Amino acid sequence: VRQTTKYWVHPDNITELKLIILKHLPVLVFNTNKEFEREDSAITSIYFDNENLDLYYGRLRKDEGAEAHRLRWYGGMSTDTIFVERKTHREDWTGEKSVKARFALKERHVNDFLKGKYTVDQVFAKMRKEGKKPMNEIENLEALASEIQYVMLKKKLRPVVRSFYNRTAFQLPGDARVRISLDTELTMVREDNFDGVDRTHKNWRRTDIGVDWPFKQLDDKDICRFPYAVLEVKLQTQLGQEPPEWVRELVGSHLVEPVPKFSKFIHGVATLLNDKVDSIPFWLPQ
């Protein structure tokens, strides 16, 4: 049985919270000398929606099958691999869950792919040629890309909001019993042109910022500097036991504030496009 929960963490409780976790879990690092630079922690996502904000409303109301679409990269602006990600909301008798699917695209192909000029076949030509991945897996990835490209064109999606944050990942590899992420410097930035400002100049992302938090060059109206860290806890508890006592103690402690449905996408839209949206998540006033 797997459970996911999200919490806010006041800046005054961040260090103390880290000390508790690191007592039990290692931090993942991605260089072999186990040294890391400032940009290594960065994760940036460009969320797409249309001018009616169809996707925002779908995710807000938690419609069955409501999709969120985002283009994500890890690290700094030299990063060339862009993840085209789709999150789907699911509900049934067993309860709730989030389903994520993604495929990878070189940066220089992104615009052209989104316009339907660069086809899915073209996208996966090198992958098929290589013969590394089994054919069925390739055909299923291509179906994913076709579905995403179709919605993008069909619903006229465009860049709307960017989330940026630094993520620390606490996890002992090959052990999913407990996985914890702490996101700091959380920021949302406008990427839309809804007020007539062509923020991306028809690129898939603005280029007047990189990962240079705190992004002092942005106009105040374009940015939301979130005050709290966001903590996410992914448990895979073996039926029919309970989650580790240190995990339970932690989540129930004064250190964290549970915000079950929290969503950086939804927070960004509601905060930055406040005069435009007609419904608001319940972690915000009304």
PDB file of C-alpha atoms in Angstrom:
ATOM      1  CA  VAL A   1       0.000   0.000   0.000  1.00  0.00           C
ATOM      2  CA  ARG A   2       1.374   3.391  -1.064  1.00  0.00           C
ATOM      3  CA  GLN A   3       0.593   6.798   0.401  1.00  0.00           C
ATOM      4  CA  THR A   4       1.599  10.303  -0.662  1.00  0.00           C
ATOM      5  CA  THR A   5       1.242  13.380   1.510  1.00  0.00           C
ATOM      6  CA  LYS A   6       2.383  16.996   1.251  1.00  0.00           C
ATOM      7  CA  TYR A   7       3.245  19.536   3.954  1.00  0.00           C
ATOM      8  CA  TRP A   8       4.331  23.131   4.297  1.00  0.00           C
ATOM      9  CA  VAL A   9       7.377  23.840   6.431  1.00  0.00           C
ATOM     10  CA  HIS A  10       8.040  27.278   7.927  1.00  0.00           C
ATOM     11  CA  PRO A  11      11.609  28.560   7.299  1.00  0.00           C
ATOM     12  CA  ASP A  12      12.177  28.429  11.084  1.00  0.00           C
ATOM     13  CA  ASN A  13      11.637  24.667  11.090  1.00  0.00           C
ATOM     14  CA  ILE A  14      13.648  23.688   8.010  1.00  0.00           C
ATOM     15  CA  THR A  15      17.015  22.834   9.553  1.00  0.00           C
ATOM     16  CA  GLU A  16      15.519  20.934  12.476  1.00  0.00           C
ATOM     17  CA  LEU A  17      13.366  18.988  10.005  1.00  0.00           C
ATOM     18  CA  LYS A  18      16.385  18.089   7.861  1.00  0.00           C
ATOM     19  CA  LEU A  19      18.326  16.755  10.854  1.00  0.00           C
ATOM     20  CA  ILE A  20      15.493  14.348  11.645  1.00  0.00           C
ATOM     21  CA  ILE A  21      15.301  12.928   8.159  1.00  0.00           C
ATOM     22  CA  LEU A  22      19.052  12.600   7.549  1.00  0.00           C
ATOM     23  CA  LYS A  23      19.258  10.569  10.735  1.00  0.00           C
ATOM     24  CA  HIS A  24      17.361   7.873   8.805  1.00  0.00           C
ATOM     25  CA  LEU A  25      17.908   8.550   5.105  1.00  0.00           C
ATOM     26  CA  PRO A  26      20.836   9.322   2.753  1.00  0.00           C
ATOM     27  CA  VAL A  27      20.674  12.136   0.231  1.00  0.00           C
ATOM     28  CA  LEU A  28      20.894  11.191  -3.459  1.00  0.00           C
ATOM     29  CA  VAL A  29      23.672  12.889  -5.422  1.00  0.00           C
ATOM     30  CA  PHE A  30      24.344  12.621  -9.135  1.00  0.00           C
ATOM     31  CA  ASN A  31      28.095  13.184  -9.555  1.00  0.00           C
ATOM     32  CA  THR A  32      30.489  10.284  -8.966  1.00  0.00           C
ATOM     33  CA  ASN A  33      32.812  12.403  -6.798  1.00  0.00           C
ATOM     34  CA  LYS A  34      29.705  13.132  -4.702  1.00  0.00           C
ATOM     35  CA  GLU A  35      30.278  16.855  -5.085  1.00  0.00           C
ATOM     36  CA  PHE A  36      27.446  19.068  -6.263  1.00  0.00           C
ATOM     37  CA  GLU A  37      27.085  22.636  -7.538  1.00  0.00           C
ATOM     38  CA  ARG A  38      24.309  25.159  -6.813  1.00  0.00           C
ATOM     39  CA  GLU A  39      22.372  24.373 -10.032  1.00  0.00           C
ATOM     40  CA  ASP A  40      22.423  20.589  -9.434  1.00  0.00           C
ATOM     41  CA  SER A  41      19.405  20.895  -7.096  1.00  0.00           C
ATOM     42  CA  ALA A  42      17.271  22.935  -9.541  1.00  0.00           C
ATOM     43  CA  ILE A  43      14.039  21.644 -11.064  1.00  0.00           C
ATOM     44  CA  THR A  44      12.093  23.854 -13.465  1.00  0.00           C
ATOM     45  CA  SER A  45       8.718  23.065 -15.012  1.00  0.00           C
ATOM     46  CA  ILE A  46       6.722  25.025 -17.581  1.00  0.00           C
ATOM     47  CA  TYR A  47       3.030  24.239 -17.110  1.00  0.00           C
ATOM     48  CA  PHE A  48       0.859  24.559 -20.212  1.00  0.00           C
ATOM     49  CA  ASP A  49      -2.835  25.522 -20.355  1.00  0.00           C
ATOM     50  CA  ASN A  50      -5.114  27.521 -22.687  1.00  0.00           C
ATOM     51  CA  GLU A  51      -6.567  30.999 -22.253  1.00  0.00           C
ATOM     52  CA  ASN A  52      -9.749  29.512 -20.690  1.00  0.00           C
ATOM     53  CA  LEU A  53      -7.535  27.735 -18.163  1.00  0.00           C
ATOM     54  CA  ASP A  54      -9.247  24.410 -18.906  1.00  0.00           C
ATOM     55  CA  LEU A  55      -6.498  22.314 -17.389  1.00  0.00           C
ATOM     56  CA  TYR A  56      -6.304  24.414 -14.222  1.00  0.00           C
ATOM     57  CA  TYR A  57     -10.028  24.017 -13.568  1.00  0.00           C
ATOM     58  CA  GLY A  58      -9.885  20.269 -14.271  1.00  0.00           C
ATOM     59  CA  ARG A  59      -7.066  19.737 -11.763  1.00  0.00           C
ATOM     60  CA  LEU A  60      -8.677  22.086  -9.213  1.00  0.00           C
ATOM     61  CA  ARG A  61     -12.026  20.219  -9.236  1.00  0.00           C
ATOM     62  CA  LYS A  62     -10.148  16.933  -9.375  1.00  0.00           C
ATOM     63  CA  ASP A  63     -12.068  15.632 -12.412  1.00  0.00           C
ATOM     64  CA  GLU A  64     -11.425  11.951 -13.144  1.00  0.00           C
ATOM     65  CA  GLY A  65      -8.673  11.897 -15.782  1.00  0.00           C
ATOM     66  CA  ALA A  66      -7.819  15.622 -15.421  1.00  0.00           C
ATOM     67  CA  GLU A  67      -4.422  16.164 -17.082  1.00  0.00           C
ATOM     68  CA  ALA A  68      -1.609  18.533 -16.241  1.00  0.00           C
ATOM     69  CA  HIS A  69       1.038  19.121 -18.936  1.00  0.00           C
ATOM     70  CA  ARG A  70       4.517  20.370 -18.189  1.00  0.00           C
ATOM     71  CA  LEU A  71       7.973  20.550 -19.747  1.00  0.00           C
ATOM     72  CA  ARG A  72      10.613  19.994 -17.138  1.00  0.00           C
ATOM     73  CA  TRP A  73      14.412  20.167 -16.918  1.00  0.00           C
ATOM     74  CA  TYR A  74      16.791  19.427 -14.045  1.00  0.00           C
ATOM     75  CA  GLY A  75      19.738  21.690 -13.302  1.00  0.00           C
ATOM     76  CA  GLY A  76      20.976  24.793 -15.081  1.00  0.00           C
ATOM     77  CA  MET A  77      20.433  26.376 -18.468  1.00  0.00           C
ATOM     78  CA  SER A  78      23.042  24.198 -20.189  1.00  0.00           C
ATOM     79  CA  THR A  79      20.734  21.217 -19.588  1.00  0.00           C
ATOM     80  CA  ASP A  80      19.604  19.992 -22.990  1.00  0.00           C
ATOM     81  CA  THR A  81      17.237  17.160 -22.155  1.00  0.00           C
ATOM     82  CA  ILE A  82      13.654  18.342 -21.685  1.00  0.00           C
ATOM     83  CA  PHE A  83      11.043  16.057 -20.137  1.00  0.00           C
ATOM     84  CA  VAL A  84       7.578  16.339 -21.664  1.00  0.00           C
ATOM     85  CA  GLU A  85       5.457  15.224 -18.685  1.00  0.00           C
ATOM     86  CA  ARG A  86       1.750  14.453 -18.276  1.00  0.00           C
ATOM     87  CA  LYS A  87       0.114  13.940 -14.871  1.00  0.00           C
ATOM     88  CA  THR A  88      -3.347  12.369 -14.793  1.00  0.00           C
ATOM     89  CA  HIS A  89      -5.747  12.422 -11.836  1.00  0.00           C
ATOM     90  CA  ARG A  90      -7.386   9.048 -11.046  1.00  0.00           C
ATOM     91  CA  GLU A  91     -10.296   8.121  -8.747  1.00  0.00           C
ATOM     92  CA  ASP A  92     -12.025   4.819  -8.059  1.00  0.00           C
ATOM     93  CA  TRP A  93     -13.268   2.523  -5.288  1.00  0.00           C
ATOM     94  CA  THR A  94      -9.749   2.165  -3.862  1.00  0.00           C
ATOM     95  CA  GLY A  95      -9.457   5.940  -3.629  1.00  0.00           C
ATOM     96  CA  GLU A  96      -7.155   8.422  -5.325  1.00  0.00           C
ATOM     97  CA  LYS A  97      -3.847   8.486  -7.174  1.00  0.00           C
ATOM     98  CA  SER A  98      -1.667  10.503  -9.556  1.00  0.00           C
ATOM     99  CA  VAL A  99      -0.359   8.874 -12.729  1.00  0.00           C
ATOM    100  CA  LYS A 100       2.782  10.405 -14.304  1.00  0.00           C
ATOM    101  CA  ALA A 101       4.058   9.662 -17.821  1.00  0.00           C
ATOM    102  CA  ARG A 102       6.878  11.323 -19.769  1.00  0.00           C
ATOM    103  CA  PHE A 103       9.201  11.131 -22.738  1.00  0.00           C
ATOM    104  CA  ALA A 104      12.395  13.048 -23.422  1.00  0.00           C
ATOM    105  CA  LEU A 105      13.097  15.654 -26.097  1.00  0.00           C
ATOM    106  CA  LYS A 106      16.177  17.647 -27.071  1.00  0.00           C
ATOM    107  CA  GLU A 107      15.631  21.351 -26.312  1.00  0.00           C
ATOM    108  CA  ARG A 108      16.045  22.478 -29.940  1.00  0.00           C
ATOM    109  CA  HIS A 109      13.145  20.298 -31.041  1.00  0.00           C
ATOM    110  CA  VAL A 110      10.609  21.467 -28.438  1.00  0.00           C
ATOM    111  CA  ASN A 111       8.943  24.386 -30.266  1.00  0.00           C
ATOM    112  CA  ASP A 112       8.695  22.419 -33.499  1.00  0.00           C
ATOM    113  CA  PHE A 113       7.271  19.372 -31.819  1.00  0.00           C
ATOM    114  CA  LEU A 114       4.654  21.421 -29.973  1.00  0.00           C
ATOM    115  CA  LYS A 115       3.545  23.054 -33.253  1.00  0.00           C
ATOM    116  CA  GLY A 116       3.141  19.597 -34.794  1.00  0.00           C
ATOM    117  CA  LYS A 117       5.917  20.354 -37.308  1.00  0.00           C
ATOM    118  CA  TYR A 118       8.293  17.773 -35.855  1.00  0.00           C
ATOM    119  CA  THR A 119       6.272  14.513 -35.864  1.00  0.00           C
ATOM    120  CA  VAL A 120       6.304  11.710 -33.267  1.00  0.00           C
ATOM    121  CA  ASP A 121       7.889   9.405 -35.826  1.00  0.00           C
ATOM    122  CA  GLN A 122      10.674  11.949 -36.312  1.00  0.00           C
ATOM    123  CA  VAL A 123      10.991  12.323 -32.543  1.00  0.00           C
ATOM    124  CA  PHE A 124      11.538   8.610 -32.041  1.00  0.00           C
ATOM    125  CA  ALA A 125      13.507   7.834 -35.250  1.00  0.00           C
ATOM    126  CA  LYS A 126      16.864   7.831 -33.476  1.00  0.00           C
ATOM    127  CA  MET A 127      15.425   5.731 -30.624  1.00  0.00           C
ATOM    128  CA  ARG A 128      14.060   3.031 -32.942  1.00  0.00           C
ATOM    129  CA  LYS A 129      17.274   3.022 -34.995  1.00  0.00           C
ATOM    130  CA  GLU A 130      19.293   2.344 -31.841  1.00  0.00           C
ATOM    131  CA  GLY A 131      17.317  -0.779 -30.925  1.00  0.00           C
ATOM    132  CA  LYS A 132      18.173  -0.431 -27.224  1.00  0.00           C
ATOM    133  CA  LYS A 133      14.578  -0.210 -25.907  1.00  0.00           C
ATOM    134  CA  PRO A 134      12.190  -3.105 -26.637  1.00  0.00           C
ATOM    135  CA  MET A 135       9.715  -2.374 -29.429  1.00  0.00           C
ATOM    136  CA  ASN A 136       6.539  -2.507 -27.322  1.00  0.00           C
ATOM    137  CA  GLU A 137       7.997   0.041 -24.916  1.00  0.00           C
ATOM    138  CA  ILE A 138       8.874   2.277 -27.837  1.00  0.00           C
ATOM    139  CA  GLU A 139       5.381   1.984 -29.364  1.00  0.00           C
ATOM    140  CA  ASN A 140       3.831   2.907 -26.017  1.00  0.00           C
ATOM    141  CA  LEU A 141       6.132   5.950 -25.611  1.00  0.00           C
ATOM    142  CA  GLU A 142       5.215   7.085 -29.121  1.00  0.00           C
ATOM    143  CA  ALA A 143       1.509   6.724 -28.274  1.00  0.00           C
ATOM    144  CA  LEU A 144       2.170   8.965 -25.232  1.00  0.00           C
ATOM    145  CA  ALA A 145       3.862  11.590 -27.422  1.00  0.00           C
ATOM    146  CA  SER A 146       1.060  11.439 -29.992  1.00  0.00           C
ATOM    147  CA  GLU A 147      -1.572  11.896 -27.237  1.00  0.00           C
ATOM    148  CA  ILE A 148       0.313  14.855 -25.739  1.00  0.00           C
ATOM    149  CA  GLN A 149       0.982  16.516 -29.077  1.00  0.00           C
ATOM    150  CA  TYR A 150      -2.680  16.044 -30.005  1.00  0.00           C
ATOM    151  CA  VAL A 151      -4.031  17.734 -26.818  1.00  0.00           C
ATOM    152  CA  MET A 152      -1.477  20.555 -27.106  1.00  0.00           C
ATOM    153  CA  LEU A 153      -2.721  21.358 -30.608  1.00  0.00           C
ATOM    154  CA  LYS A 154      -6.373  20.477 -29.981  1.00  0.00           C
ATOM    155  CA  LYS A 155      -6.778  22.508 -26.772  1.00  0.00           C
ATOM    156  CA  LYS A 156      -4.392  25.227 -27.999  1.00  0.00           C
ATOM    157  CA  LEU A 157      -2.162  24.892 -24.956  1.00  0.00           C
ATOM    158  CA  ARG A 158       0.604  27.472 -24.378  1.00  0.00           C
ATOM    159  CA  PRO A 159       3.111  28.190 -21.579  1.00  0.00           C
ATOM    160  CA  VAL A 160       1.245  29.617 -18.572  1.00  0.00           C
ATOM    161  CA  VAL A 161       3.235  29.217 -15.376  1.00  0.00           C
ATOM    162  CA  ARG A 162       6.731  28.112 -14.385  1.00  0.00           C
ATOM    163  CA  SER A 163       7.524  26.460 -11.083  1.00  0.00           C
ATOM    164  CA  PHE A 164      11.122  26.553  -9.874  1.00  0.00           C
ATOM    165  CA  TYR A 165      12.540  24.999  -6.730  1.00  0.00           C
ATOM    166  CA  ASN A 166      15.562  23.251  -5.248  1.00  0.00           C
ATOM    167  CA  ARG A 167      14.846  19.666  -4.307  1.00  0.00           C
ATOM    168  CA  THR A 168      16.720  17.508  -1.833  1.00  0.00           C
ATOM    169  CA  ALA A 169      15.926  13.824  -2.202  1.00  0.00           C
ATOM    170  CA  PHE A 170      16.133  11.616   0.878  1.00  0.00           C
ATOM    171  CA  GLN A 171      16.097   8.013  -0.209  1.00  0.00           C
ATOM    172  CA  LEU A 172      18.055   4.802   0.301  1.00  0.00           C
ATOM    173  CA  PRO A 173      18.330   3.369  -3.242  1.00  0.00           C
ATOM    174  CA  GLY A 174      16.577   0.045  -3.790  1.00  0.00           C
ATOM    175  CA  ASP A 175      14.326   0.763  -0.827  1.00  0.00           C
ATOM    176  CA  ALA A 176      11.026   2.516  -1.581  1.00  0.00           C
ATOM    177  CA  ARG A 177       9.521   1.874   1.841  1.00  0.00           C
ATOM    178  CA  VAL A 178      10.091   5.573   2.468  1.00  0.00           C
ATOM    179  CA  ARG A 179      10.993   8.375   0.040  1.00  0.00           C
ATOM    180  CA  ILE A 180      11.102  12.042   1.011  1.00  0.00           C
ATOM    181  CA  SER A 181      11.582  15.258  -0.962  1.00  0.00           C
ATOM    182  CA  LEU A 182      12.139  18.703   0.472  1.00  0.00           C
ATOM    183  CA  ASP A 183      11.594  21.581  -1.928  1.00  0.00           C
ATOM    184  CA  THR A 184      12.987  25.012  -1.088  1.00  0.00           C
ATOM    185  CA  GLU A 185      13.166  28.376  -2.860  1.00  0.00           C
ATOM    186  CA  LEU A 186       9.788  27.493  -4.418  1.00  0.00           C
ATOM    187  CA  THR A 187       8.881  30.093  -6.991  1.00  0.00           C
ATOM    188  CA  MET A 188       6.162  30.503  -9.584  1.00  0.00           C
ATOM    189  CA  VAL A 189       6.628  32.746 -12.619  1.00  0.00           C
ATOM    190  CA  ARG A 190       4.199  33.944 -15.281  1.00  0.00           C
ATOM    191  CA  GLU A 191       4.857  32.513 -18.757  1.00  0.00           C
ATOM    192  CA  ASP A 192       1.508  33.513 -20.312  1.00  0.00           C
ATOM    193  CA  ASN A 193       0.555  36.371 -22.616  1.00  0.00           C
ATOM    194  CA  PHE A 194      -2.920  36.912 -21.132  1.00  0.00           C
ATOM    195  CA  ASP A 195      -2.367  40.604 -20.460  1.00  0.00           C
ATOM    196  CA  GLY A 196      -0.910  41.169 -23.929  1.00  0.00           C
ATOM    197  CA  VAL A 197       2.705  40.701 -22.831  1.00  0.00           C
ATOM    198  CA  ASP A 198       4.355  38.026 -25.028  1.00  0.00           C
ATOM    199  CA  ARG A 199       6.546  36.776 -22.195  1.00  0.00           C
ATOM    200  CA  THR A 200       8.163  33.870 -24.065  1.00  0.00           C
ATOM    201  CA  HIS A 201       8.442  35.599 -27.441  1.00  0.00           C
ATOM    202  CA  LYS A 202       6.784  32.469 -28.807  1.00  0.00           C
ATOM    203  CA  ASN A 203       9.418  30.160 -27.299  1.00  0.00           C
ATOM    204  CA  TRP A 204       8.296  27.317 -25.005  1.00  0.00           C
ATOM    205  CA  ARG A 205       9.837  29.179 -22.027  1.00  0.00           C
ATOM    206  CA  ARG A 206      10.885  32.746 -21.064  1.00  0.00           C
ATOM    207  CA  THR A 207      14.599  33.332 -21.684  1.00  0.00           C
ATOM    208  CA  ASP A 208      15.121  36.400 -19.482  1.00  0.00           C
ATOM    209  CA  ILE A 209      15.557  34.142 -16.503  1.00  0.00           C
ATOM    210  CA  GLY A 210      17.506  30.948 -15.946  1.00  0.00           C
ATOM    211  CA  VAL A 211      17.750  29.203 -12.609  1.00  0.00           C
ATOM    212  CA  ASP A 212      19.154  32.330 -11.000  1.00  0.00           C
ATOM    213  CA  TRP A 213      16.846  32.494  -7.995  1.00  0.00           C
ATOM    214  CA  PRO A 214      15.599  34.767  -6.589  1.00  0.00           C
ATOM    215  CA  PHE A 215      15.074  36.244 -10.061  1.00  0.00           C
ATOM    216  CA  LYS A 216      15.325  39.888  -9.028  1.00  0.00           C
ATOM    217  CA  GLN A 217      14.958  41.033 -12.647  1.00  0.00           C
ATOM    218  CA  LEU A 218      11.288  39.992 -12.868  1.00  0.00           C
ATOM    219  CA  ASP A 219       8.494  42.468 -12.357  1.00  0.00           C
ATOM    220  CA  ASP A 220       6.739  41.916  -9.037  1.00  0.00           C
ATOM    221  CA  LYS A 221       3.526  40.906 -10.834  1.00  0.00           C
ATOM    222  CA  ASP A 222       5.285  38.094 -12.674  1.00  0.00           C
ATOM    223  CA  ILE A 223       6.572  36.205  -9.671  1.00  0.00           C
ATOM    224  CA  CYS A 224       5.383  34.443  -6.546  1.00  0.00           C
ATOM    225  CA  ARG A 225       8.139  33.740  -4.039  1.00  0.00           C
ATOM    226  CA  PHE A 226       6.573  31.046  -1.852  1.00  0.00           C
ATOM    227  CA  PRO A 227       7.519  31.510   1.856  1.00  0.00           C
ATOM    228  CA  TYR A 228       7.502  27.860   2.930  1.00  0.00           C
ATOM    229  CA  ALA A 229       9.430  24.746   2.024  1.00  0.00           C
ATOM    230  CA  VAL A 230       7.304  21.974   0.606  1.00  0.00           C
ATOM    231  CA  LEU A 231       7.812  18.486   2.011  1.00  0.00           C
ATOM    232  CA  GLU A 232       6.494  15.385   0.247  1.00  0.00           C
ATOM    233  CA  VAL A 233       6.379  11.912   1.798  1.00  0.00           C
ATOM    234  CA  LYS A 234       6.045   8.814  -0.404  1.00  0.00           C
ATOM    235  CA  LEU A 235       5.415   5.655   1.603  1.00  0.00           C
ATOM    236  CA  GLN A 236       5.274   2.058   0.357  1.00  0.00           C
ATOM    237  CA  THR A 237       4.165   0.243   3.514  1.00  0.00           C
ATOM    238  CA  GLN A 238       3.979  -3.573   3.460  1.00  0.00           C
ATOM    239  CA  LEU A 239       0.429  -4.735   4.176  1.00  0.00           C
ATOM    240  CA  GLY A 240      -0.706  -4.717   6.739  1.00  0.00           C
ATOM    241  CA  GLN A 241       1.878  -2.922   8.864  1.00  0.00           C
ATOM    242  CA  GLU A 242       2.115   0.781   9.658  1.00  0.00           C
ATOM    243  CA  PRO A 243       4.584   3.445   8.433  1.00  0.00           C
ATOM    244  CA  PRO A 244       7.821   3.668  10.481  1.00  0.00           C
ATOM    245  CA  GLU A 245       7.395   5.331  13.868  1.00  0.00           C
ATOM    246  CA  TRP A 246       9.870   8.119  13.035  1.00  0.00           C
ATOM    247  CA  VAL A 247       7.837   8.975   9.938  1.00  0.00           C
ATOM    248  CA  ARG A 248       4.557   9.041  11.868  1.00  0.00           C
ATOM    249  CA  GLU A 249       6.095  11.083  14.675  1.00  0.00           C
ATOM    250  CA  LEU A 250       7.458  13.562  12.144  1.00  0.00           C
ATOM    251  CA  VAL A 251       4.296  14.169  10.105  1.00  0.00           C
ATOM    252  CA  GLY A 252       2.220  14.640  13.258  1.00  0.00           C
ATOM    253  CA  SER A 253       4.742  17.047  14.738  1.00  0.00           C
ATOM    254  CA  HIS A 254       4.528  20.845  14.924  1.00  0.00           C
ATOM    255  CA  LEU A 255       7.359  20.881  12.365  1.00  0.00           C
ATOM    256  CA  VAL A 256       5.093  20.400   9.342  1.00  0.00           C
ATOM    257  CA  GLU A 257       1.648  21.613   8.225  1.00  0.00           C
ATOM    258  CA  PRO A 258      -0.321  19.088   6.133  1.00  0.00           C
ATOM    259  CA  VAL A 259      -1.825  20.500   2.913  1.00  0.00           C
ATOM    260  CA  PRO A 260      -3.234  17.327   1.284  1.00  0.00           C
ATOM    261  CA  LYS A 261      -4.151  18.627  -2.170  1.00  0.00           C
ATOM    262  CA  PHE A 262      -1.327  21.162  -2.571  1.00  0.00           C
ATOM    263  CA  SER A 263      -0.236  21.745  -6.164  1.00  0.00           C
ATOM    264  CA  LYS A 264       2.464  24.098  -7.392  1.00  0.00           C
ATOM    265  CA  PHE A 265       0.628  24.403 -10.725  1.00  0.00           C
ATOM    266  CA  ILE A 266      -2.643  25.321  -9.071  1.00  0.00           C
ATOM    267  CA  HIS A 267      -0.959  27.645  -6.580  1.00  0.00           C
ATOM    268  CA  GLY A 268       0.858  29.460  -9.375  1.00  0.00           C
ATOM    269  CA  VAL A 269      -2.199  30.037 -11.522  1.00  0.00           C
ATOM    270  CA  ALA A 270      -4.414  31.141  -8.633  1.00  0.00           C
ATOM    271  CA  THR A 271      -1.785  33.515  -7.197  1.00  0.00           C
ATOM    272  CA  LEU A 272      -0.396  34.987 -10.408  1.00  0.00           C
ATOM    273  CA  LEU A 273      -3.626  35.063 -12.420  1.00  0.00           C
ATOM    274  CA  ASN A 274      -5.821  35.964  -9.456  1.00  0.00           C
ATOM    275  CA  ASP A 275      -8.016  38.458 -11.356  1.00  0.00           C
ATOM    276  CA  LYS A 276      -8.543  35.881 -14.054  1.00  0.00           C
ATOM    277  CA  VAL A 277      -9.507  32.674 -12.222  1.00  0.00           C
ATOM    278  CA  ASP A 278     -13.111  32.115 -11.034  1.00  0.00           C
ATOM    279  CA  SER A 279     -12.334  29.397  -8.432  1.00  0.00           C
ATOM    280  CA  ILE A 280      -9.504  29.143  -5.928  1.00  0.00           C
ATOM    281  CA  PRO A 281      -7.855  26.275  -4.049  1.00  0.00           C
ATOM    282  CA  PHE A 282      -8.801  26.035  -0.393  1.00  0.00           C
ATOM    283  CA  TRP A 283      -5.307  26.676   0.928  1.00  0.00           C
ATOM    284  CA  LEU A 284      -5.926  30.257  -0.291  1.00  0.00           C
ATOM    285  CA  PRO A 285      -8.557  32.845   0.840  1.00  0.00           C
ATOM    286  CA  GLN A 286     -11.915  31.375  -0.308  1.00  0.00           C
TER     287      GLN A 286
END
